[PDB]
Design a binder for this molecule. Structure first.
Ligand code: POV
Ligand code: EPJ
Ligand code: CA
Ligand code: CA
Ligand code: CA
Ligand code: CA
Ligand code: CA
Lengths: 394, 394, 394, 394, 394
């Protein structure tokens, strides 16, 4: 009875085009904020952030004011889209094909005219994803909101601190905060300035998932590559194991490519670590070829360069702690035995070459192990957030 | 004739903005429930639940009341969207880009004013998917429904028990129940509290499909890896078989990655089992390298450490139940035969080393078999629902 | 002139909410049917059927009746959506996100009031896909149509036989028929019963495509696996060929996984055939390991068990139709020759072991060939529709 | 001033439901045509054609006629959707989920009443893709347009020749023409016949892209398979190379499966060529197994069948242009040398068997080369459009 | 008060169909331009460009003019879609399924009538992507805008220079400029000409990302292929390494296929480089087969052709800087030693053949290295933009 009477009363002469101010010259203060409920997705390949947001726009409509003594029990009213004047606050850096993913709900006014509008929405925003430090990355994704067609002389946008009480954790991202900032910028279209409120969603990637699925698996598969330096050459599978492991490591780069954007701003840390890993494994294949050249060396070929005979079989070897008828019968039997002596000398030369191959195996085992350890640690601890990560997520 | 007269009568002075109560001060009781017809999808990578639902909102419109004696035969009327007041009950934790996937249908009222509204919809909900125990997982997905813009002082939401008579089984999920709960929560936006009805869809994953496609296949491929310990070394394919099998096992981890979300809350049970499996296979490769070092051991290299000669060829070996011219001619023929004796001694030393390699093969066959059995069973039976599963689904 | 006059006449006092009956108490007969033009897609992973359909709803509007003598030449009129009363016949088991994929077109009425409404649409329906017999499967997909908000006491739904004259064949599916059925069911929401018309689209999968791309390719690749039993052991590639072929066969299971749903209702026939195939190939690898153990057997190791020496080298072998100074010089030359005799005896023992390996090769060639033939035929001919298929599609 | 006056004048008593004819009994002539701007996509897996089209519907509205002397300068007017009567010409064989992808624009009328309507749209059409001859295929995709709800007695549809002046070439398809045809068909729904205009878009696939990425790559990889017949057997990699190449060739069949639909109407030419290629490579593996059986033949096993000793080492071989104490000492030394003579005879028998293996290598090199050349050319030149293609696209 | 009065005043007799000119005969000048904010995507497979654009349409409405002295403080008004006349400027070469991706916002007018309309949108445009020079490619994507239904005699379209102040860099593309051009074209539909404004977005691909992920990885994997010419033949893994590396290189062609469109206009530079690389690696496999034929050459087979003995072991070899009872006992011992001499001669012939294999290894190492260097550099520096790229992006 009083809700009916008031609803009829409030739409007499009301125009949803008129900015609801009493004095036309003064701008209309709109307080803007948001409640972040969830970080639904971070599409780094497409540079998009999908969030569940409850935008919070509060202002004062000069015309929607009633005296509750004359409408007992009627303390608030609600208006759907298109019936009340609303601020046309859009997300500037939107990535949604419709460009406006907001779901239009009611505007709740009280007896004093204060209008409250809390549209829910799944919002896609074009966010620059700094992949320089991935997986130990922190992203600062801006959500820039402003009135599209009202300038500062008409809509005085004011910012209120972001709401995160109802935020639901993600699993992959630790909300580090949503600091906001109000700016007054000038545009090349127009002379009247335009204010905007930009909320910078700061997100820390939780590194356990990518650590367990990308970093540690590659470390351990990369470690298998070093087993080539412990394999004997006579097994006939050094090259097979090494080349198989290297070409298996490409799957991780393929996975990263499925994740990372095709940008040239920088090289992600994961790529630099994966690249150094493959280069070290590839150099192990090159060194395996050299080792097999030493092992399969023709004894009657070139002689052993003194530089090799000392740099490897003396120093590096020590460092590693390795270490008438009867005359015709005499002639024939002496050729057989001299042939055997020549074969013994050839085996001895081949044995020394095989020893050189083994010494090289051990030196490169040590050197590639040290290279792996340093490169891995020095590339991973070059991330500013590395320590924070290992402490929080492991 | 009477349907026409009544329809004209019911829209005189009717405003779809007014809450249809007789006394403005009292809240309007809306009974909310749903009928779950099907679980269409559980997107665990995106943390979304897609369901076919017939939301059930029943309330009383004070104005839509007629006396059937004056409209004979006209016992119910129907109103489309936008013509009658409706409760704006939205799904809070919606994952749909439009945010509101409800399909708007008629509101069936009777002569007494009781309005019945049963919109169908394909609803996507942002559900936290606990992947800790996958594939033997049980999920509790909340569907939180509430009036967006009416608080407790205006819309007295009441819950009715969920309907599942028409539920159509899924194939992958056993509905364990849909218990509901009505809550009265306060929000940081507003002072008036807001009630909601949350239905927790409890779902048990049927484990036959993932058991047959992930667990048993990996067990059997992982078992092939143990055949390396039965392969002879002279075959020259131990490393080939082992490394090939391990890098083949990566496909299962790739499949899981296609399924699982990128979250750091926990490690899924499937991942822990797959990881232990690959580590055991990788250790078999490491032990294969050691075995080949023993098999391909240079007889003139280091001598056999006593610790090895006993720990392997005495105890472990027993445990396993294994086990002038003529003078010149004499000189030359004696060098040939002494050379043969030296080769025999070298074959004997190599034969002992090959025996050590075989004993290690057998010990690691036993040990890796026991490791496989324990780890597999102890990781699978660490799931609370494991027994329930094996009994219902196998 | 007469079309204008009649259109103005027909909308006087017309309300699109009123069911167009003369007597309010009697239900309104709506004849429902459909014309199936094409089967666009069968998504078995998502359990959805996409069809091009021209729903056919015919009824009688009591008010849209004119005398053609008073409107010469005006024999039919047309009304767009929202202007005429229509039956709100929805597809209950809809899988479309909008839930209602119907495209709203005109309602053609004649001078006698008979209204004809033929909306086109691309309809997605949640259909249970029985994958038990795939690829030789027949599916029965229900399209359940009914008025959402009118019960039996108001809308007397009646079924007309489905139209298939304009049906366009698919390539993958042979329409076996679209039998319909009218049901009168009661629902737990309401007391008035609700009728529905369900058309069961029965579809036979044409098996040539999946036969050529899945079954015959796997048969032939699986046949290559049997070549291991004809490969000599000295080639040093038995394990390589066998393990390579088995891990190559996984691609077919991966393809099926891309096709099949993740359901535990049953095991598809394709999976049972692929699984038996991989198990037979995997057992060939196990038997290859045993063969290589026999081939690479240390002559000075264990002696040949009599059970083996007869079960293989006697019966199975036959069945297969296989089959002072001079004294010092005498001493030294006699040791060399006795060494040669010991090597000859060792070669003879190794030769017998290699013969055992060859006999096992042949027996398993025969046995795995017979296993392959039976298992393949017995799993494929266990499908009821197998014969129908091979006759129609090959 | 005159544009305002005329716009007000033209909507007096205008009803967008009335067919704008002067005499109700006569059908209304609508001239239909289209301008094809681009062929955006041919989805052969889904059997859909996506095109950018400017449908051209011209007719005469009896009511939208003004005398330009009374409205100086006002020579044309424009009307948006829903304000003027339009022909409801839909695309019958539509594949779009909305079913109607047309974008509604203005209808430009002149002073004489001739209405011109040129809606743009991205149109998806359900087109049967004959994949029999792919990649050398020509497709005939029908776009069938007609009034949905006006029959021949009301809407006299007439066809105008298709417009292609503004057509933008594609890269993959050579528009061979868009011949149209007007038909008058009867439908099982209705008695009044219904006319339609069907434009058959005829498209020739440009074969350079698929030739370079599928046909020539497979030819060259398939050629590598023939290198097995030039590899020596002692290399120990014949089976490895052959089996690796064959299982690598599966990627091309996987690519085709990603492209081709799952239809049983026919076997695409690409599939028949790829299948013959894999069968020839697979037979090379089978022949490699036989070659290795000849190479690794036990000299003390079966004797050489005369049929082999002539069919291979005589004819085929020629065709190819290949080709007391002292007594004890005498006894012992004569056993050693007789042992050597037995080894020489065994090497000779093995040498003849290895020669047989080499002759078989050469014969199968020749035969599989000829098989490859014929099969390739005879399958590729069995396409009617093969010559046209090679001449236009290479 | 004055905003309300003016809004009521401005819609009296206003018709959004009338072109707002004072003199009907003269065309209406519309100034068109755009502000490019971001290049969201370049889909080269689909030939589509996705951009964030703020179209800028400014014109003069003759009717929306007020005197600010009579409406103090009211200096601008705003009108939503459908209430004010707007230019129907569409994107002709649109690729969006809806065809019109513009988001409709307000039209800001001032007291003098100048209307300003700045709709945001995510625009998809059908752009011909010249992939001839990819990854060092520059694309010229046209955005063609024009009034759909107003010709030159009615809407005088005029171009304003594109705005790029607020442009946000991409990562993958360097905006080289957005030059625009106004054209006056005639169409085959109509006699009145139609003007359009086409903005050609010129974009330079930043080549660091594709350089690091495609070009350098392939170079380095292709370099591993050359290690076959340094591998010894006795290792028994030349063919394995070479064939494995070649079939691994196919992944890059697969990646390019995922990126490139299926067009026959040209061959992308990346494809020509990848193709030459695989052909060079494939020829290394062919040469590896020849090398193994030389290494595994039967000594008692054909004799060494003089042409080989000089072209390889003399010139190329030098260029590369390589280099009674006792009588019976005499008979028997002389046969053994003559057998040894025959084996020595056979080893010498085999040794010369192995030397030929080694010389061929070295020559092809040199030749394939030079081929790799030239082909790589000559294909990469055949791109016009190659130098620009290497200087800006590396
Ligand atoms: C055409 C397709 C290829 C089909 C078959 C392979 C062709 C070669 C088979 C014969 C090998 C030669 C041989 O020695 O065989 C021996 C065994 O042979 C048998 O008795 C069985 C042979 C048939 C095998 C069937 C399974 C094929 C595997 C699937 C392959 C499918 C390929 C799929 C294509 C993608 C014969 O014995 P023997 O040596 O003569 O004994 C000497 C006796 N003596 C001591 C008294 C002297
Ligand atoms: Cl009513 C109408 C609609 C479209 C057109 C056409 C003329 C120019 C070129 C295509 C389109 N714009 C002309 N008239
Ligand atoms: Ca993420
Ligand atoms: Ca699921
Ligand atoms: Ca199907
Ligand atoms: Ca195509
Ligand atoms: Ca791009």
């Amino acid at each position: 009875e009083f809700q009916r009477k008031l609803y009829k009363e409030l739409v007499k002469n009301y125009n949803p085009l008129e900015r609801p101010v009493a004095n036309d010259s003064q701008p209309l203060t709109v307080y803007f904020s948001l409640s972040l409920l969830q970080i639904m997705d971070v599409d780094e390949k497409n540079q998009v952030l999908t969030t569940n947001i409850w935008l919070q726009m509060s202002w004062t409509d000069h015309y929607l004011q009633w005296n509750v003594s004359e409408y007992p029990g009627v303390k608030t009213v609600r208006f759907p889209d298109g019936q009340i004047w609303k601020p046309d606050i859009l997300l500037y850096n939107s990535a949604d094909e419709r460009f406006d993913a907001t779901f239009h709900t009611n505007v709740l006014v009280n007896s004093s005219g204060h209008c409250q509008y809390l549209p829910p929405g799944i919002f896609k925003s074009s966010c620059y994803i700094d992949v320089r430090w991935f997986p130990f990355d922190v992203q600062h994704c801006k959500l820039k909101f402003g009135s599209w067609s009202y300038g500062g002389w008409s809509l005085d946008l004011q910012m209120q601190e972001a709401d995160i009480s109802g935020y639901i954790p993600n699993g992959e991202w630790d909300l580090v905060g949503i600091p906001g900032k109000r700016s007054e910028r000038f545009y090349e279209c127009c002379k009247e300035p335009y204010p905007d409120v930009t909320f910078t969603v700061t997100m820390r990637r939780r590194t356990l998932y990518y650590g367990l699925n990308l970093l540690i698996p590659c470390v351990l598969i990369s470690a298998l590559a070093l087993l080539v330096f412990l394999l004997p050459a006579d097994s006939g599978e050094k090259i097979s194991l090494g080349i198989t492991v290297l070409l298996s490591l490409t799957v991780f780069m393929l996975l990263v490519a499925e994740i990372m954007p095709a940008t040239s701003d920088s090289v992600p840390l994961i790529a630099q670590y994966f690249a150094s890993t493959m280069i070290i494994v590839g150099l192990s294949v090159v060194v395996t070829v050299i080792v097999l050249q030493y092992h399969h060396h023709d004894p009657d070929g070139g002689k052993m360069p003194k530089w090799t005979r000392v740099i490897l079989l003396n120093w590096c070897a020590w460092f590693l702690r390795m270490k008438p008828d009867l005359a015709k019968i005499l002639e024939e039997v002496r050729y057989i035995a001299n042939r055997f002596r020549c074969q013994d000398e050839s085996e001895a030369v081949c044995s020394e070459w095989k020893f050189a191959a083994c010494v090289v195996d051990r030196l490169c085992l040590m050197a590639f192990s040290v290279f792996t350890i340093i490169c891995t640690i020095g590339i991973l601890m070059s991330a500013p957030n590395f320590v924070e990560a290992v402490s929080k997520d492991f």
